[PDB]
C-alpha cells in the first residue's frame, strides 16, 4: 500500500563500497516521545564519512542515508515542547539516525531541529545547514575570530569554502584563499565581497607559503582552515587519491605568531621539529569535526543555538550556498555515488 | 615592532627536513630488533 | 560599549535561555554525595 | 668609582653550564630615546630557558640575568610618552635585554613597563609578574575560560600553579589539580578557596586519568594546563632527569570533548592514533610560550594591557604569589644555580 | 546584559585605548600599493 | 544526553599502543636502506 522510499548505505570492505536501491518503509507511525514526524521538503547530500561510521561501530547492515533536512512538522510526540504541527523547521539528522533523510517523511529528535526563517526557501536552507554549521564551528569555537585577524581559507572555492569565506567577511576578517582550477579563481573573482587576495596552486610551482606570507608582509596568517594536508605521502606513493594538497611544512611556516590552525585531516603526524616550530610561534592547533554534536552531543544547547543563528545569517543574506540545480528523489542515488566519491563543488539537494 | 616580528619569522623559517615515516616505522623498529 | 560587544562576542549562546538549559552542565560530584548520604539518612 | 654589579650568563656546551660572578657596570648613562632608567627595587629569579636562547641565537658571551623587575622611574628619554620620573612601575625585561635585571638601576624599553598599583608591595608584585603573565596567557588566549568549564592544572602546587589555580577560581572554573609531595597536597588543602579535588600522583600507582575522569563523571576535562609530558622516555631511559610526568595517552583520554589542552613541552610527538583521538574529541591543542611577547613582540599592546590587568588582579588580591623570603643581591648567584636546576616551589626574589 | 558581558569577556584589551594603538595592525597591502603608484605619479 | 556522552568517551578509550620511536627512527629508516 502506501510506502515511503529510503536509501540505505551498506557496510562492506571498510569503505568506498556503498550501493543499494531505496527500500520501502511501510506504515511507519510516529512512535517515541521526543521524536517528531516531518513532511520532508528537502534533503541535502554529503559525502558519507564512512570511516567514521566504521570506528563509530554501529552494527547495521543498512545505514540511513540523507541527514541535512528541511521540512514541515506533521506531528509531535507527547513530551515535545518547542514544536507544534504545521511548523516549518530545518536541521541535521544525527549520524546514528533511525530513519533516512532520503524519504518524504521523517522521525527525528526534536533538538536537532530549528525553525526556518520566513525569507529563505527550503532548498537553499537545507543545502546550507551542514556547511553552515561546520564552518561556524571552524570560525567560532576552534578558532576565534575578530576583525583584523588574517584568515587563510584553503580550497575556499568549494561548496564549504563559500560559507567559510562569507562567515569570515561577515566577521570583518581579511581572507586569503586558494583556488585549484582557473574557473575556481574566476569564482573567487565573482565574489561580491572583494577578498584580499587569490592565491593560485594551479601551476606546477606551488607558492602557497611564499605568496601568502608576502600578502601578510611578514606578519603571518592567523587562522588557516586547511582542507587537507599533503603529509604522509611525500616520499611514498605521491598524490594518493590524486591529491595536490598543501605540504605540512609550508602551512606551518605560513602560520602567523599566536595563530590558529584548524585542520580537517584525521591522521596528522606532528614531528618534533614541527612541534618546535609551533612552540616558537605559540600557535594553537585545533581539529575540525562537525559531527561531535550528534554522536557525542554533550553541548546540545550550544549547537542548537548555532543553527538558528546560522539561519539568522541566512535570512539576512550573509550566506549564499553553492547549490546545484535541485533533483528529484529517484535520480539521487546515481548522483550520490559520485558525491560519495568527491564533492562536485556544487551542492546537490533533493527537493520534495 | 613590525620589523622585529617580520625579522622573527624570517629567522624562524627552517628548510623542509621531511620526516613522516611513522606508519611504516612502527613495524620497522620492531622488525629491526 | 557599542562596537566592543559586537567585536568580542560575535556569537552568543545566551540569546536563547530555553536552549541554554538544554546543554549539559558540569558534573558536580559534591552535591551528589551530599544528596547520597542525606537521602540515606 | 661608582659601579653597578650585574650577573651574566655564559653560553657554553648548549645548556646547564651557567656560571660567573657579577661584573661591573661603570658610568652607565640613560642613552637611547625610548629606554628609561629605573631604580630597581626588586628582581625575581626564573630558570633560564637556555635552549631557547641557543636557538634564538644571539651571539653574546655574556647574557644579562634577571628579567622580572619592579622599581621607580629615575629618568626617561625624550620620546617617552607614558612615563615620568619618580613613577613606580613593574615589568618584564625582554629576553634580548641589553641590561641585566640583577642590578640596582636598569635601562629598559618603556612598553615593557606598567604602573604599580598602590596596594601591592615591590617584592610581591615583582615576584608575580612572570607567572601572572604566563598563566594569564594560558587561561585567556590559548585556552578560553568561562565559568562551568572544568580545568585540570597539573602540578598546580608549584609557584606557577598557584597563580593558575587562583586565576581559574577567579573565572569561576572548577579545578582538579595534581600534587606530587604529600606536603604539596597539604598546600592544596591550605587554599582558602576550596578546589574541587586534589589528585595524588605521590603513590607508585598513577591514577591521574581514571580518578580525574570520575571526578568529571565521564563528562571529561576541558582545559588541561599540563606542565610536562612523560612521552619519548617511556621505553628508552625511563624518568629522564628523574621525571614522573604524566603519560601522553592518559592525558589525551582524559581530555573532554571540545577540550583545550595547553602544553608546555617543546618536543611533542603526536602519533596518528593520538591525532585520531583528538579528531574524535574535537580537541584543541595549544602551546604555551610566555616569551613570544618579548622576542616576537607583535601584539605588544595586548600584552601590555595584560600586565596592568594582572596588577589589577593583584591589587584586588586575587593573586597571592608563592614567595620565598627575599634575599640580598650578593647571595642571589648561589641561589640562582639551584633555581637554574629546578624551581624551588617558592618564588625567589632579590629586593633592593 | 549584566552577567553576560562579564562571562563572555572576562578580559578585555580595549580597556586602554592608548595601549590599543601600540599593537601591530594588519598589513594591508592594497593601501600601500595605492600610495606607491600615487606617490610616484 | 549526559549518559550518551559518557558512553561516547567510554567507547572512545583505547589502550596505550605506545609508539614514540621518531627520534631514533629518523636515523633508523635511512640507515636500514
Amino acid at each position: 500500500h502506501h510506502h515511503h522510499k529510503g536509501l540505505y548505505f551498506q557496510q562492506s570492505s571498510t569503505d568506498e563500497e556503498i550501493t543499494f536501491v531505496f527500500q520501502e518503509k511501510e506504515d511507519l507511525p510516529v512512535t517515541e516521545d521526543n521524536f517528531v514526524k516531518l513532511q520532508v521538503k528537502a534533503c541535502a547530500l554529503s559525502q558519507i564519512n564512512t570511516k567514521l561510521l566504521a570506528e563509530m561501530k554501529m552494527k547495521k547492515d543498512l545505514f540511513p542515508v540523507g541527514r541535512e533536512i528541511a521540512g514541515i512538522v506533521l506531528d509531535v510526540g507527547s513530551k515535545v515542547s518547542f514544536f507544534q504541527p504545521d511548523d516549518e523547521v530545518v536541521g541535521i539528522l544525527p549520524l546514528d539516525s533511525e530513519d533516512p533523510g532520503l524519504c518524504e517523511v521523517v522521525r527525528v529528535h526534536e533538538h536537532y531541529l530549528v525553525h526556518k526563517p520566513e525569507k529563505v526557501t527550503w532548498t537553499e536552507a537545507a543545502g546550507s545547514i551542514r556547511d553552515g554549521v561546520r564552518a561556524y564551528t571552524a570560525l567560532h569555537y576552534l578558532s576565534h575570530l575578530s576583525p583584523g585577524k588574517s584568515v587563510l581559507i584553503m580550497d575556499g572555492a568549494s561548496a564549504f569554502g563559500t560559507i567559510a569565506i562569507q562567515l569570515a567577511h561577515h566577521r570583518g576578517a581579511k581572507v586569503i584563499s586558494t583556488a585549484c582550477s582557473l574557473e575556481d579563481k574566476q569564482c573567487l573573482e565573482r565574489f561580491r565581497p572583494p577578498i584580499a587576495r587569490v592565491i593560485d596552486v594551479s601551476n606546477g610551482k606551488v607558492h602557497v607559503a611564499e605568496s601568502c606570507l608576502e600578502e601578510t608582509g611578514g606578519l603571518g596568517v592567523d587562522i588557516v582552515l586547511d582542507a587537507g594536508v599533503r603529509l604522509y605521502s611525500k616520499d611514498d606513493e605521491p598524490a594518493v587519491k590524486l591529491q595536490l594538497l598543501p605540504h605540512k611544512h609550508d602551512i606551518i611556516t605560513l602560520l602567523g605568531v599566536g595563530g590558529h590552525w584548524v585542520t580537517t585531516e584525521e591522521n596528522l603526524q606532528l614531528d618534533p621539529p614541527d612541534s618546535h616550530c609551533l612552540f616558537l610561534k605559540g600557535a594553537t592547533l585545533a581539529f575540525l569535526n562537525d559531527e561531535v554534536w550528534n554522536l557525542s552531543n554533550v553541548q546540545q544547547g550550544k549547537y542548537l543555538c548555532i543553527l538558528k543563528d546560522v539561519m539568522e545569517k541566512l535570512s539576512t543574506g550573509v550566506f549564499r550556498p553553492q547549490l546545484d540545480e535541485p533533483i528529484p528523489l529517484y535520480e539521487a542515488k546515481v548522483s550520490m555515488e559520485a558525491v560519495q566519491k568527491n564533492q562536485g563543488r556544487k551542492k546537490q539537494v533533493v527537493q520534495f | 615592532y613590525k620589523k622585529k616580528a617580520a625579522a622573527y619569522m624570517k629567522s624562524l623559517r627552517k628548510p623542509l627536513l621531511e620526516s613522516v615515516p611513522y606508519e611504516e616505522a612502527l613495524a620497522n623498529r620492531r622488525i629491526l630488533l | 560599549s557599542l562596537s566592543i560587544i559586537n567585536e568580542k562576542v560575535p556569537f552568543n549562546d545566551t540569546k536563547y535561555s530555553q536552549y541554554n538549559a538544554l546543554n549539559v552542565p558540569l558534573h558536580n560530584r559534591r552535591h551528589q554525595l551530599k544528596m547520597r548520604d542525606i537521602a540515606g539518612q
Side-chain angles (χ1 to χ4, degrees), chain A residues 82 111 136 140-141 145-147 171 298-302 304-306 308-309, chain C residues 6-16 18-25:
Chain A
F82 312 99
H111 310 115
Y136 211 85
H140 209 268
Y141 280 109
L145 281 175
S146 160
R171 303 272 202 255
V298 55
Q299 50 193 27
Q300 183 53 300
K302 308 272 191 178
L304 184 62
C305 181
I306 290 282
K308 205 173 293 292
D309 208 347
Chain C
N6 300 327
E7 158 181 339
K8 270 57 182 185
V9 193
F11 173 89
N12 216 32
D13 53 13
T14 317
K15 323 263 212 179
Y16 297 146
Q18 53 192 353
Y19 296 161
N20 190 20
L22 184 59
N23 59 37
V24 166

Short mmCIF file of all heavy atoms in Angstrom, two decimals, chain A residues 82 111 136 140-141 145-147 171 298-302 304-306 308-309, chain C residues 6-16 18-25:
data_model
loop_
_atom_site.label_atom_id
_atom_site.label_comp_id
_atom_site.label_asym_id
_atom_site.label_seq_id
_atom_site.Cartn_x
_atom_site.Cartn_y
_atom_site.Cartn_z
N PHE A 82 9.08 22.40 22.19
CA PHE A 82 9.41 23.54 21.36
C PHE A 82 8.67 23.55 20.03
O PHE A 82 8.87 24.48 19.25
CB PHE A 82 10.90 23.58 21.07
CG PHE A 82 11.76 23.41 22.28
CD1 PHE A 82 12.32 22.19 22.58
CD2 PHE A 82 12.03 24.48 23.10
CE1 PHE A 82 13.11 22.03 23.69
CE2 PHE A 82 12.83 24.33 24.21
CZ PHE A 82 13.37 23.10 24.50
N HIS A 111 15.45 18.18 19.17
CA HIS A 111 16.53 19.13 19.39
C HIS A 111 17.58 19.05 18.32
O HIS A 111 18.68 19.58 18.49
CB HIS A 111 17.11 18.87 20.76
CG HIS A 111 16.05 18.79 21.80
ND1 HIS A 111 15.79 17.64 22.50
CD2 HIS A 111 15.21 19.73 22.28
CE1 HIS A 111 14.80 17.86 23.34
NE2 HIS A 111 14.43 19.12 23.24
N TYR A 136 30.78 27.38 10.86
CA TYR A 136 30.58 28.20 12.04
C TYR A 136 31.33 27.61 13.22
O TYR A 136 31.84 28.34 14.08
CB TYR A 136 29.09 28.27 12.32
CG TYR A 136 28.64 29.54 12.97
CD1 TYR A 136 28.35 30.63 12.18
CD2 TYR A 136 28.59 29.69 14.32
CE1 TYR A 136 27.94 31.80 12.72
CE2 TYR A 136 28.19 30.86 14.88
CZ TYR A 136 27.87 31.92 14.07
OH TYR A 136 27.46 33.11 14.61
N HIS A 140 34.23 29.82 14.89
CA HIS A 140 33.85 30.46 16.13
C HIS A 140 34.12 29.67 17.40
O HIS A 140 34.00 30.24 18.48
CB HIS A 140 32.40 30.88 16.09
CG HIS A 140 32.15 32.07 16.94
ND1 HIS A 140 31.77 31.96 18.26
CD2 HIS A 140 32.32 33.38 16.70
CE1 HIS A 140 31.68 33.17 18.78
NE2 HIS A 140 32.00 34.05 17.85
N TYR A 141 34.46 28.41 17.32
CA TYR A 141 34.79 27.71 18.54
C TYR A 141 36.23 27.25 18.56
O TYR A 141 36.96 27.52 19.51
CB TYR A 141 33.85 26.53 18.74
CG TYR A 141 32.57 27.01 19.29
CD1 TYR A 141 31.42 27.02 18.53
CD2 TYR A 141 32.51 27.50 20.58
CE1 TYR A 141 30.24 27.49 19.06
CE2 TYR A 141 31.34 27.98 21.12
CZ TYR A 141 30.21 27.97 20.35
OH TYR A 141 29.05 28.45 20.90
N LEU A 145 37.53 34.28 15.90
CA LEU A 145 37.65 35.43 15.04
C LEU A 145 37.47 36.72 15.80
O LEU A 145 36.98 36.75 16.93
CB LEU A 145 36.61 35.40 13.93
CG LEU A 145 36.90 34.50 12.77
CD1 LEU A 145 35.72 34.53 11.86
CD2 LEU A 145 38.04 35.13 12.09
N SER A 146 37.85 37.79 15.14
CA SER A 146 37.70 39.19 15.48
C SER A 146 38.19 39.90 14.24
O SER A 146 39.08 39.37 13.57
CB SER A 146 38.49 39.61 16.71
OG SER A 146 38.68 41.01 16.70
N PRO A 147 37.60 41.02 13.86
CA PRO A 147 38.13 41.80 12.73
C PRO A 147 39.57 42.21 12.96
O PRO A 147 39.98 42.53 14.08
CB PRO A 147 37.20 43.01 12.67
CG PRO A 147 36.35 42.94 13.87
CD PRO A 147 36.29 41.52 14.28
N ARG A 171 32.53 38.62 9.72
CA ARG A 171 33.17 38.92 10.97
C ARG A 171 34.37 39.82 10.78
O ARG A 171 35.25 39.87 11.64
CB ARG A 171 33.56 37.63 11.66
CG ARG A 171 32.36 36.78 11.85
CD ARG A 171 31.72 37.13 13.13
NE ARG A 171 30.88 36.07 13.65
CZ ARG A 171 29.55 36.09 13.60
NH1 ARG A 171 28.93 37.14 13.08
NH2 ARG A 171 28.84 35.09 14.08
N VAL A 298 27.24 16.52 23.68
CA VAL A 298 27.26 16.98 25.05
C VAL A 298 26.70 18.39 25.15
O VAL A 298 25.80 18.65 25.95
CB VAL A 298 28.67 16.83 25.66
CG1 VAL A 298 29.74 17.52 24.86
CG2 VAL A 298 28.67 17.43 27.03
N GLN A 299 27.17 19.30 24.32
CA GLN A 299 26.72 20.69 24.37
C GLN A 299 25.64 20.94 23.33
O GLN A 299 25.75 21.78 22.46
CB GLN A 299 27.93 21.60 24.22
CG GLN A 299 28.81 21.24 23.04
CD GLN A 299 30.15 21.92 23.05
OE1 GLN A 299 30.67 22.28 24.10
NE2 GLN A 299 30.73 22.08 21.87
N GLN A 300 24.55 20.19 23.50
CA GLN A 300 23.43 20.21 22.55
C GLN A 300 22.81 21.59 22.44
O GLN A 300 22.38 22.00 21.36
CB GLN A 300 22.37 19.22 23.00
CG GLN A 300 21.10 18.98 22.15
CD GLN A 300 21.31 18.64 20.68
OE1 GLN A 300 21.88 19.40 19.92
NE2 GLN A 300 20.86 17.46 20.29
N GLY A 301 22.75 22.30 23.56
CA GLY A 301 22.20 23.64 23.55
C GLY A 301 23.00 24.61 22.71
O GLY A 301 22.42 25.40 21.96
N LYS A 302 24.33 24.55 22.82
CA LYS A 302 25.19 25.45 22.06
C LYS A 302 24.99 25.26 20.58
O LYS A 302 24.70 26.21 19.86
CB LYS A 302 26.65 25.18 22.40
CG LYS A 302 27.00 25.19 23.86
CD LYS A 302 27.36 26.56 24.36
CE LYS A 302 27.96 26.48 25.74
NZ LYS A 302 28.38 27.80 26.27
N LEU A 304 22.47 23.83 19.08
CA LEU A 304 21.12 24.14 18.66
C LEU A 304 20.99 25.64 18.45
O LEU A 304 20.36 26.08 17.49
CB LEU A 304 20.13 23.62 19.68
CG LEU A 304 18.70 23.85 19.25
CD1 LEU A 304 18.50 23.08 17.98
CD2 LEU A 304 17.81 23.24 20.28
N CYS A 305 21.62 26.43 19.33
CA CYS A 305 21.66 27.87 19.16
C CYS A 305 22.39 28.24 17.88
O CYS A 305 22.03 29.23 17.21
CB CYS A 305 22.32 28.52 20.36
SG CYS A 305 22.38 30.30 20.28
N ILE A 306 23.43 27.47 17.54
CA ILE A 306 24.27 27.74 16.37
C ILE A 306 23.42 27.70 15.12
O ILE A 306 23.52 28.58 14.26
CB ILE A 306 25.43 26.74 16.25
CG1 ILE A 306 26.45 26.95 17.34
CG2 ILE A 306 26.06 26.75 14.88
CD1 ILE A 306 27.34 28.05 17.12
N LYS A 308 20.15 28.05 14.60
CA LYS A 308 19.21 29.14 14.45
C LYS A 308 19.93 30.44 14.13
O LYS A 308 19.42 31.25 13.35
CB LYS A 308 18.35 29.29 15.69
CG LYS A 308 17.04 29.93 15.37
CD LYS A 308 16.16 29.90 16.57
CE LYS A 308 15.79 28.48 16.89
NZ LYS A 308 14.91 27.91 15.86
N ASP A 309 21.09 30.67 14.73
CA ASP A 309 21.84 31.85 14.34
C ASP A 309 22.38 31.74 12.92
O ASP A 309 22.49 32.76 12.23
CB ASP A 309 22.95 32.14 15.33
CG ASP A 309 23.28 33.61 15.40
OD1 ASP A 309 22.84 34.37 14.52
OD2 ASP A 309 23.93 34.04 16.36
N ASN C 6 30.02 43.87 20.06
CA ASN C 6 29.98 43.21 18.77
C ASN C 6 31.31 42.52 18.46
O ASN C 6 31.32 41.41 17.93
CB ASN C 6 29.62 44.20 17.67
CG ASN C 6 28.27 44.83 17.88
OD1 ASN C 6 27.36 44.20 18.41
ND2 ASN C 6 28.13 46.08 17.47
N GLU C 7 32.42 43.19 18.74
CA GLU C 7 33.73 42.64 18.40
C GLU C 7 34.06 41.40 19.24
O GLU C 7 34.40 40.35 18.69
CB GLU C 7 34.81 43.70 18.55
CG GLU C 7 36.21 43.16 18.75
CD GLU C 7 37.23 44.24 18.92
OE1 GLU C 7 36.97 45.39 18.52
OE2 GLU C 7 38.31 43.95 19.46
N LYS C 8 34.00 41.53 20.56
CA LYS C 8 34.44 40.45 21.44
C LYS C 8 33.49 39.27 21.39
O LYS C 8 33.92 38.11 21.49
CB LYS C 8 34.63 40.92 22.88
CG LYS C 8 36.02 41.45 23.24
CD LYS C 8 36.48 42.61 22.36
CE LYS C 8 37.86 43.08 22.70
NZ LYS C 8 38.30 44.29 21.95
N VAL C 9 32.20 39.52 21.26
CA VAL C 9 31.22 38.45 21.28
C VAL C 9 30.43 38.52 19.99
O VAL C 9 29.34 39.11 19.96
CB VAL C 9 30.25 38.55 22.46
CG1 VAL C 9 29.47 37.27 22.61
CG2 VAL C 9 30.97 38.90 23.72
N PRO C 10 30.97 38.02 18.88
CA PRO C 10 30.18 38.00 17.65
C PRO C 10 28.99 37.06 17.73
O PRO C 10 27.90 37.41 17.28
CB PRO C 10 31.20 37.53 16.61
CG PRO C 10 32.53 37.77 17.21
CD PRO C 10 32.33 37.52 18.65
N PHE C 11 29.19 35.89 18.32
CA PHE C 11 28.13 34.92 18.51
C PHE C 11 27.95 34.72 19.99
O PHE C 11 28.91 34.62 20.74
CB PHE C 11 28.42 33.56 17.84
CG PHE C 11 27.42 32.50 18.19
CD1 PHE C 11 26.29 32.35 17.43
CD2 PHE C 11 27.62 31.61 19.24
CE1 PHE C 11 25.36 31.39 17.74
CE2 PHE C 11 26.68 30.65 19.56
CZ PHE C 11 25.55 30.55 18.80
N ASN C 12 26.70 34.61 20.39
CA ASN C 12 26.36 34.38 21.76
C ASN C 12 25.49 33.13 21.81
O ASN C 12 24.75 32.85 20.87
CB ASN C 12 25.61 35.57 22.33
CG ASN C 12 25.96 35.84 23.74
OD1 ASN C 12 27.08 35.60 24.15
ND2 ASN C 12 25.01 36.35 24.50
N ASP C 13 25.61 32.36 22.88
CA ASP C 13 24.77 31.20 23.09
C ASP C 13 23.63 31.48 24.04
O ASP C 13 22.73 30.65 24.18
CB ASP C 13 25.63 30.05 23.62
CG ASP C 13 26.43 30.44 24.87
OD1 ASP C 13 26.20 31.50 25.49
OD2 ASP C 13 27.36 29.69 25.23
N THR C 14 23.67 32.63 24.69
CA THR C 14 22.75 33.03 25.73
C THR C 14 21.61 33.85 25.14
O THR C 14 20.80 34.43 25.88
CB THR C 14 23.53 33.79 26.80
OG1 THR C 14 24.75 33.08 27.03
CG2 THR C 14 22.82 33.75 28.16
N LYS C 15 21.56 33.95 23.80
CA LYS C 15 20.44 34.58 23.12
C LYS C 15 19.15 33.87 23.47
O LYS C 15 18.09 34.49 23.59
CB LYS C 15 20.63 34.51 21.61
CG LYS C 15 22.03 34.66 21.08
CD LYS C 15 22.36 36.07 20.64
CE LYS C 15 23.36 36.03 19.47
NZ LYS C 15 23.75 37.37 18.93
N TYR C 16 19.22 32.55 23.63
CA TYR C 16 18.08 31.71 23.89
C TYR C 16 18.29 31.07 25.25
O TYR C 16 19.24 30.29 25.42
CB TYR C 16 18.02 30.65 22.80
CG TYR C 16 17.80 31.20 21.40
CD1 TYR C 16 18.39 30.56 20.32
CD2 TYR C 16 17.21 32.44 21.17
CE1 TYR C 16 18.29 31.06 19.06
CE2 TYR C 16 17.09 32.93 19.88
CZ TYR C 16 17.64 32.23 18.84
OH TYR C 16 17.55 32.70 17.56
N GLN C 18 15.98 29.11 26.77
CA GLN C 18 15.34 27.81 26.69
C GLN C 18 16.29 26.76 26.13
O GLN C 18 16.33 25.63 26.62
CB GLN C 18 14.06 27.96 25.86
CG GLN C 18 14.28 28.61 24.50
CD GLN C 18 13.00 29.01 23.83
OE1 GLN C 18 11.91 28.69 24.31
NE2 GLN C 18 13.11 29.74 22.73
N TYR C 19 17.06 27.11 25.10
CA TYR C 19 18.07 26.19 24.62
C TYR C 19 19.22 26.09 25.60
O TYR C 19 19.83 25.03 25.74
CB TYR C 19 18.59 26.62 23.26
CG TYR C 19 17.56 26.60 22.18
CD1 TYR C 19 17.74 27.31 21.03
CD2 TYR C 19 16.42 25.81 22.30
CE1 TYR C 19 16.80 27.30 20.04
CE2 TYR C 19 15.48 25.79 21.31
CZ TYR C 19 15.67 26.53 20.18
OH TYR C 19 14.72 26.49 19.19
N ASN C 20 19.53 27.22 26.26
CA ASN C 20 20.66 27.29 27.17
C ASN C 20 20.53 26.29 28.29
O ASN C 20 21.54 25.77 28.77
CB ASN C 20 20.79 28.69 27.77
CG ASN C 20 22.08 28.88 28.51
OD1 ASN C 20 23.04 28.14 28.32
ND2 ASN C 20 22.10 29.86 29.41
N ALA C 21 19.31 26.02 28.73
CA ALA C 21 19.12 25.00 29.75
C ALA C 21 19.51 23.62 29.23
O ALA C 21 20.03 22.80 29.99
CB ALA C 21 17.67 25.00 30.22
N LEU C 22 19.27 23.37 27.94
CA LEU C 22 19.38 22.02 27.40
C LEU C 22 20.80 21.46 27.45
O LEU C 22 20.98 20.26 27.66
CB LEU C 22 18.83 21.99 25.98
CG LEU C 22 18.78 20.62 25.31
CD1 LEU C 22 17.93 19.72 26.13
CD2 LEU C 22 18.20 20.75 23.94
N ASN C 23 21.80 22.31 27.23
CA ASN C 23 23.18 21.83 27.23
C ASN C 23 23.60 21.30 28.60
O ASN C 23 23.10 21.74 29.63
CB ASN C 23 24.15 22.91 26.70
CG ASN C 23 24.15 24.22 27.48
OD1 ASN C 23 24.03 24.27 28.70
ND2 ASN C 23 24.32 25.32 26.75
N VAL C 24 24.43 20.26 28.57
CA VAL C 24 24.84 19.52 29.76
C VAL C 24 25.61 20.42 30.71
O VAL C 24 26.59 21.06 30.30
CB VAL C 24 25.69 18.32 29.35
CG1 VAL C 24 26.41 17.74 30.52
CG2 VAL C 24 24.81 17.28 28.77
N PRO C 25 25.24 20.48 31.98
CA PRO C 25 26.01 21.25 32.96
C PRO C 25 27.11 20.39 33.57
O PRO C 25 27.16 19.18 33.38
CB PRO C 25 24.96 21.60 34.00
CG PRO C 25 24.08 20.42 33.98
CD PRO C 25 24.02 19.94 32.57
#
